[PDB]
C-alpha cells in the first residue's frame, strides 16, 4: 500500500554506477547547413532544414581496422576522415595517439607516406585537406594526405624545445590545448608559437604504474613554480603555399612588442583577423599589462610587420588583465574592425567595438550584469552569452545585437522555456544560418536547433524525456538560488535541498566550497553529482556561495583579493556558513565544508581558521601554500614571491602555518600520487605540518592518479570514502 | 589507581634505566653518569672522572659521540651527526690530546667523513671520506691515501653499499685492523649496474621543488653489488708512493657466479678468514689466509677451506655465523646446524673438514660470546626448554660434559633473559637480564664467577609501577601438528578469565624471528593492555627462529604461506580458549609483520575483524635481493618466479572486502618502498574496497621523528579502538 508515492531516493551507487543517464546532443557543424552525429555509432550528416539523416559512415567500416578508434575528424572539404587511436592521455589537453586517414571518396586508407607513431597533435587546414602534424615537437605539413611530409621545423628537443605544441604551463593556464598552431582562413599560412623550456625547473614525482614495475617510474615535468625562470615563446608564420621538396621552409618570425621584451613576458592569444592579417595578445609576467599587436602580411617583403599605430594596450590598475586572459578579438570580415569583451570603467566586462587605427572603442552594451562570451559575428548581427536576464549572474542567455544600432538587442533564449531553462549555451553553423542552443538548468538539460535568419524553433534534438521518465517516483532534491546582502552588496549562493525539506527541522550542511579568482558556484545549472545523492540520500543540505573574488558580477567583487589570496574569499566561506546557520534550518553542531583544488585549499584555511564554525571538512588535492603552484596562474593573484613584492602574502597565506587550528576539527586530506597539477607536494607539506603539531586527521592518497582522480574505480572509491568520513562525521547511521 | 596511557608510553614517563658500560681494559669500563665520563674499577666499584663534562664547553659545537683509542691517548669527539640508513651516517670530528689536553688543529680529519675506527691497539686511526680509506698514524700527522677510486654511489672503499649495509654486515663500516693494528683490511663495492631506487624527498617547507633520491638498491632478481677484498699493510706506509693495497679473490666455488662477502674475521696476527655466500644462499666458503713473507701476500691454502651449506634452506639464521679462534688461530669455534638441524657450537680444527659438535640438544646456542684458554661463554635457550629465554652458560673446553649456568639461579623469578659483556680478556663480565622482570644489570668477575654488586636494578622503575594497574605477560606454547609452538599474552590487569576479552594480534613472523619471550617491555602493548583492556597476543609459528631448522625451514621458497596460516590458527586457537571476544579479534604489524597481517586479512579466513599494516612489503620483487632472495630464490621461471606470483598482497585484495583496514607507510622509506603500499592501495582501488590509509611525509621504515611516532601510534590507537567499539 505504496499508493505511488516517491518512495526511491537518489543513492550513492545511483550516482557511482551512472543509473540516470543525462542525455546529450553532441553534434559538429560540418558546413552552414549540415551538422554530424553519432546514432549506432553509426555517424550521419543531418540537414538542420529538414531532417535527412542519410547514413554518413557505418561503424562497420574500421573494424578491418584493428585497433579501437578513440575520435575521428573530417577535412573541411568532406574529401578525407582522419583516424585517431591509439590515444594515450598526457596532461589536461595534450596526448599522442596513431593517425591513419581514409579516403572518403576512394573507400580506402592512405597508406603511403602515413601519419608517424605518438604523433603529438594533429590539424586540418580550414579548407580543403591540408594536414599539420606535431611529432618529436617538430611541425610538419602535408599538403596531400598521401604525399610525403614537408618538415617545417628541425629544433625541437623533449622537455626543452616545442614547436607548435604547448608545454605544461601554456597547456593548462594559457590555451587551455595542446595545439599551438593557428592556420590562416584560407589555409595559406601556419602560424605557430615556439616555447623554450631550457631553464624552466622540474617537478619530480614517481609513477608507480602497474604491479608489474619493478622500480617506480620518476616522471619529470618542465613546470614553474610561482616565481621561477618561466618558459620563453617565439612565434612564427610559415606560408605553406611556397613550401619546397629541395630547401627547408623559411618560418617567417613576429617577435613581441619592445614593451613586452624588457621583461619576462607570454603570448596569451593568436586570432587570424584576414587571409593577410593576423593578431597577437602579448602578456607581461606582471599580469596587469597587455598589447594587441596586429600584424599584416607585405607581399613584397615576403615578412610579417605590426605598426605600433595598430598597437592596442589593455590593462587594469584593480587587479589582472581579462577573466583568466586578454578576452579573444572577433574581427570583421573587412579585418578592419573588432569586438572585444573588455572591463568597463565600472569594471564590468562589456562588449566593446574597436576601430583598428584608433585606440579607443565603444561599448555596444552596458549595465550592472556581464558579457561572458561573443559567440558569432554575421554583417548585421553579434551573438553573444551574457547573464543579464532578471539580474541574476549565475543564468546564461543568447542575445543577438543589431551591429547598426545598440538599442536593438534581442533575446534569443530567454523567453524559450523560462521554468525549465536559465542557462543556455551556443553551436552556430559555419556562417551562424543554424544554431543549437543548449540549455543546462534549472530543470532537465534541452537541446534545440534553430535557424538564425528568423529566429524560429525547428527542432527537439535531445528534451531527456527517458531521464525525466526515470525521476518520476524518485525523491530528488531541488535547489536554491539566491542571494544575500553584505556590505551593502548581493552575494549568492545555492542550497541543494533534500526533498520535503522543512523550514522547521535543523537540517546538517555541508559547503561545497571552490571560491576560486572568477569562480561561480551559485548558478542556474542542473547536476547530477554527489552533492544530489547527499542531499536526496543521507538529507545533508549542500550549499555553495560565490563570496569576494568570484566571477561575472563585475571588477569590485573579482579583483577583491587581488595580491590577495587565502583571506576574503576564505573568510566569505566563513561568513556564509554563519548567515547560514542564521537562517533557521541548520543544526550548528553540523557544518562541514569540502573543496577540490583551489576549493582544497579555501577549505584548508577555512578549517585552519580557528572559527569555531565547522565540524569537519575534506580537501581533495589542495594547494598548501602559493609557492608550490605554477607560476602563470599564481602570479596573476600573487604577484612574486619577492621581498621587493608579495612575498610578505605568500608566507602568510600557507595551510601550514594554520596547522595548529586543526585540533578543533576532523580533516580528512586526498590527494593523487601523480598530480602534475597542484602536486602531490602540497598536501605531503600539509599532513606533515598537522603531524609536527600533533593533531589526528584522516589522509589518503591514490596511486598514480592526477588532479582528476578520474579513473572509474578511483572515482568511485574518493566517493565511497568521502561520503564515509561524512556520515560518519553528521552521525548519519 | 591511574593506568599505563597512551601519553605515559609517548611521553616516556616511566623510563627503564640502562646501564650502557664500554670496557677499556680487563678491568676498567666507562660510564655516562652525569654529563660527566668516569672511569669505573671493577675490582672495587671506585671510580675517578676521566673527562670533566664542561671541558669541550669552549667547542661551540654539541658532542654526539666520543671514542678513546686504545692507548688511552687520545679521545675522538663526533660532531655534526647526520643520520644516513640504519647505521649509516656522517659526522666531523676532532681529536683531543690527553697527554697535552688539548685539541689538534693540523692535518684534522675531514667534514663529512663516512667512518672512523682507531686501531685495536696504539692510536693509528683510519677513516673513510668522499669514498676513499685514509690512515693517521699519529692523530696530527698528514693522513696517507690508500684508495683513489671511491665514487658517491658507485664504488665504496671501506664503507657498505645500501644492501651490505642492512642486510650482510650490520654496518657501514667495512674495514679491519689486524688485532695488533698492523694490518687494515677492506672491502671495495661496486654498485655501477646496480638499478636506483627513486622517491620523493619533500623536506622543509621551504623547499618549493621536491628533491629525488635516488639510491643504488637491487631488488629480487636485479644486478647486485660486486665486492672485491683487500689487504694494506699499515705500518710500512710512504709519503712518496701510493700505498699498495693487496687483493684476496674469493675461492673458486664462489668466482663461478654472482656471491656475497659475509664475514670478515681476523685469526692471528698474520691470518685472516673470510666468508663468502654464493647468491643462492644455501652454499657458503671460509678462506683461511695466512700472510706470506718472500711475496708480501697473502694466500688461502684451498685445503683450508670450510665449506658450510644447507639442503633444507639457507646458510646461518640470518648468515653464516662468525668464527671465534684460539689464540694459535689453528682452531675455531662457531655455531653451525647440527644434523638434527639444531644450532650448537662446532670445534673446527684449521687444517681438517670434520668439526666437532660441543653442544647438543633440542635447544640452540644464540651465540659464542668470548673464549679463554681454559673456557668458553655463550648464550643459549636450553634452561627449562623455553625458546624465548636467555642464559649464560660457561663450558669447560677440556672436558664438553662440564657446562655450567652462569646465570639461570642469579634470580630465577625475575630473570629469563640475560645478554652479557665480557671485558678485554674476559676477567669480568657484566650481565643484562631483560626480563620477565625490570632490567637488572649485575658485574661479575670470572675466576669463581661470583657477583660483585648489582649496577642497576630499576628501584627507581619499580616505585613507580606500584601504584599504577600493570599489564602481565603469559609466556607459553600451544600443541600443532605434535609441536610446540610459543606465544605470548600481555593480559589487561585485574585479568578475568570468565569475560571475553577483544584481541590484537601483534606479528612479526619473519623468518627466524622471535615475537615470543621472557623480555620485560613498555610499550604500544603496554598501553593497550593497561588502558584499553585489549589483550594483545604474538605467535611463532613455522618459520620463526630458535627452535631448529625443521621449523625455521619450513617457509623456506615459501613466504606468505606457512608463517601467514599460522597466524590465524594461532589466533583461532586464542579464541578457543574462551576469554577471547572473537567478534572482536584484530591484527596489526610493522614491516614483514606489516606483510604478514596484509596477507591475513586478504585471506577471507573471517577471523580477523580489522588490521593496521605499518610499511609493509607487498611483493617480493619490491624489497632487496640478499635478505629476499635468501628465502626466495630467483624471481624467474626457472627458479622462484610461481611463488613470487602467488604471494603478493594485491592478487588478494577482492578479500579484504571482509575487513577494514588501515595502511600507513612513510613516503622517505629507503627500506620497504613506499611503492609496496601505493601497490596494495591501487589494487584495493581497483576492486572497491574501501579502506584507511596514512603516509608520512619524509618519514622513513622506522617513522622515528617525535612528532611522526606520536602520530602514528595516537592514529592506530583510535583505529583499534573504534574497531572494538573502545570509546
Ligand atoms: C632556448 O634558450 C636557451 C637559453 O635559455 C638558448 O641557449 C643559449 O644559447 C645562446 C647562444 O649560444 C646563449 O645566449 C646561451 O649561452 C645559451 N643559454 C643556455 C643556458 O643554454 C637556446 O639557444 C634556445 N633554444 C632555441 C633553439 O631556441
Ligand atoms: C680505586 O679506584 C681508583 C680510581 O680508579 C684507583 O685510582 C687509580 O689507580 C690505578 C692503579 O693501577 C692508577 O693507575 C691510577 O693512577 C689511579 N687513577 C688515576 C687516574 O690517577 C685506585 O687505585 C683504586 N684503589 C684504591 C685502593 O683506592
Ligand atoms: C669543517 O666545517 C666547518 C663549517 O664550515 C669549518 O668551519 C668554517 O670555516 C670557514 C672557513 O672556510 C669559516 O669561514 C667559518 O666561519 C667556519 N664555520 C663554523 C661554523 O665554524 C671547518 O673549518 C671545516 N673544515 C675542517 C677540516 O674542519
Ligand atoms: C666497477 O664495475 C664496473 C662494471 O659494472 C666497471 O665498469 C666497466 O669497466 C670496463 C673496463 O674498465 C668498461 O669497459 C665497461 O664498459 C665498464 N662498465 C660500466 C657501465 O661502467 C668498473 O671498471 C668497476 N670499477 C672499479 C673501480 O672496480
Ligand atoms: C696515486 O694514484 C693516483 C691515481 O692512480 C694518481 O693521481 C692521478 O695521476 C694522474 C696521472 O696518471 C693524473 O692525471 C690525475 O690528475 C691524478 N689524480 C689525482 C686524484 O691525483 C697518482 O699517480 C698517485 N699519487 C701519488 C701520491 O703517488
Ligand atoms: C535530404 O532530402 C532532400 C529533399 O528531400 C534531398 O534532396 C533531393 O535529392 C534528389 C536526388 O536524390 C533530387 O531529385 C531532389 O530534387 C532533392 N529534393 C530537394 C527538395 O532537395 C537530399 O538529397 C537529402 N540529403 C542528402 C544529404 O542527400
Ligand atoms: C576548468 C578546470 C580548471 N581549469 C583551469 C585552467 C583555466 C584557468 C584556463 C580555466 C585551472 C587553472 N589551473 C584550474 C585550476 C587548477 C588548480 C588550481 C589550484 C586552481 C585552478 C581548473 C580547476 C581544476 O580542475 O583543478
Ligand atoms: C632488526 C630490525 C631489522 N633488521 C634487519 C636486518 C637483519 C635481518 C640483518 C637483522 C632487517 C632486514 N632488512 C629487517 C627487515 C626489514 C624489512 C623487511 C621487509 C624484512 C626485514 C628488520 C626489521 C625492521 O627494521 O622493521
Ligand atoms: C606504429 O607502430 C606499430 C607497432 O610497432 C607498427 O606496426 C606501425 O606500422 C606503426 N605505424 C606507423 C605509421 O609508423
Ligand atoms: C635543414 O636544416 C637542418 C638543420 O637546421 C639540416 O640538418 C638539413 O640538412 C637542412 N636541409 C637543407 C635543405 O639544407
Ligand atoms: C629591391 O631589391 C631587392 C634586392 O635585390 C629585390 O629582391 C627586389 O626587387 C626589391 N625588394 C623590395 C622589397 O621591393
Ligand atoms: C602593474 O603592477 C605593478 C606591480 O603591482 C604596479 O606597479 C602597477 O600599478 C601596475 N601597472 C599598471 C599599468 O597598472
Ligand atoms: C704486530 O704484528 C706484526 C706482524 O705480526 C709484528 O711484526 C709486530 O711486531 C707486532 N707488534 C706488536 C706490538 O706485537
Ligand atoms: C641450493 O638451492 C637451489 C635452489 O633451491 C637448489 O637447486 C640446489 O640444489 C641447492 N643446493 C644445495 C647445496 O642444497
Sequence with gaps: ??????????????????????????????????????QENNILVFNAEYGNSSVFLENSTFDEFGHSINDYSISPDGQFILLEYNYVKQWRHSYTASYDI???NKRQLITEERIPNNTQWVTWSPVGHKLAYVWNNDIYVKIEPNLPSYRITWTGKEDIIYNGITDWVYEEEVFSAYSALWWSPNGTFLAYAQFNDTEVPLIEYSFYSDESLQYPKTVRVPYPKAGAVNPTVKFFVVNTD????????????????????????????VTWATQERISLQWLRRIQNYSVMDICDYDESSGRWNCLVARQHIEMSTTGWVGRFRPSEPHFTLDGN?????????????????????????????????????????????????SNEYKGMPGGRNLYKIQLSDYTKVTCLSCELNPERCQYYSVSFSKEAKYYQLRCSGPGLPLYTL???????????????????????????????????????????????????????????????????????????????????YLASTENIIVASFDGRGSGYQGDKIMHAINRRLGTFEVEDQIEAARQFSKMGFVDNKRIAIWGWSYGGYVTSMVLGSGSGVFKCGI??????????????????????????????????????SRAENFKQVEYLLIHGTADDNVHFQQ???????????????????????????????????????????????????
Design 1 to 38: 500500500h505504496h499508493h505511488h508515492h516517491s518512495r526511491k531516493t537518489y543513492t550513492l551507487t545511483d550516482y557511482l554506477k551512472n543509473t540516470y543517464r543525462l542525455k546529450l546532443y553532441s553534434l559538429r557543424w560540418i558546413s552552414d547547413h549540415e551538422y554530424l552525429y553519432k
Design 102 to 104: 581514409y579516403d572518403l
Design 242 to 269: 611556397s613550401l619546397s621538396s629541395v630547401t627547408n621552409a623559411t618560418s617567417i618570425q613576429i617577435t613581441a612588442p619592445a614593451s613586452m621584451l624588457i621583461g619576462d613576458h607570454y603570448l596569451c592569444d
Design 450 to 532: 534553430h535557424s538564425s535568419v528568423n529566429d524560429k524553433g525547428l527542432r527537439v534534438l535531445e528534451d531527456n524525456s527517458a531521464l525525466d521518465k526515470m525521476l518520476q517516483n524518485v525523491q530528488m532534491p531541488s535547489k536554491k538560488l539566491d542571494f544575500i546582502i553584505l556590505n551593502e552588496t548581493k552575494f549568492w549562493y545555492q542550497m541543494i535541498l533534500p526533498p520535503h525539506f522543512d523550514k522547521s527541522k535543523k537540517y546538517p550542511l555541508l559547503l561545497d566550497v571552490y571560491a576560486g579568482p572568477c569562480s561561480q558556484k551559485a548558478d542556474t545549472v542542473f547536476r547530477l553529482n554527489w552533492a544530489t
Design 337 to 385: 574592425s573588432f569586438y572585444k569583451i573588455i572591463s568597463n570603467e565600472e569594471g564590468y566586462r562589456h562588449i566593446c567595438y574597436f576601430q583598428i587605427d584608433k585606440k579607443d572603442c565603444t561599448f555596444i552594451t552596458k549595465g550592472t550584469w556581464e558579457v561572458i562570451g561573443i559567440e558569432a559575428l554575421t554583417s548585421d548581427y553579434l551573438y553573444y552569452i
Design 683 to 733: 598536501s605531503a607539506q600539509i599532513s606533515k605540518a598537522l603531524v609536527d603539531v600533533g593533531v589526528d586527521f584522516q589522509a589518503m592518497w591514490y596511486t598514480d592518479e592526477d588532479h582528476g582522480i578520474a579513473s572509474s574505480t578511483a572515482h568511485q572509491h574518493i566517493y565511497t570514502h568521502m561520503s564515509h568520513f561524512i556520515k560518519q562525521c553528521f552521525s548519519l547511521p
Design 619 to 656: 580537501a581533495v588535492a589542495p594547494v598548501s601554500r602559493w609557492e608550490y603552484y605554477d607560476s602563470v596562474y599564481t602570479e596573476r593573484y600573487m604577484g612574486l614571491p619577492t621581498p621587493e613584492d608579495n612575498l610578505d602574502h605568500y608566507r602568510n597565506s600557507t595551510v601550514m
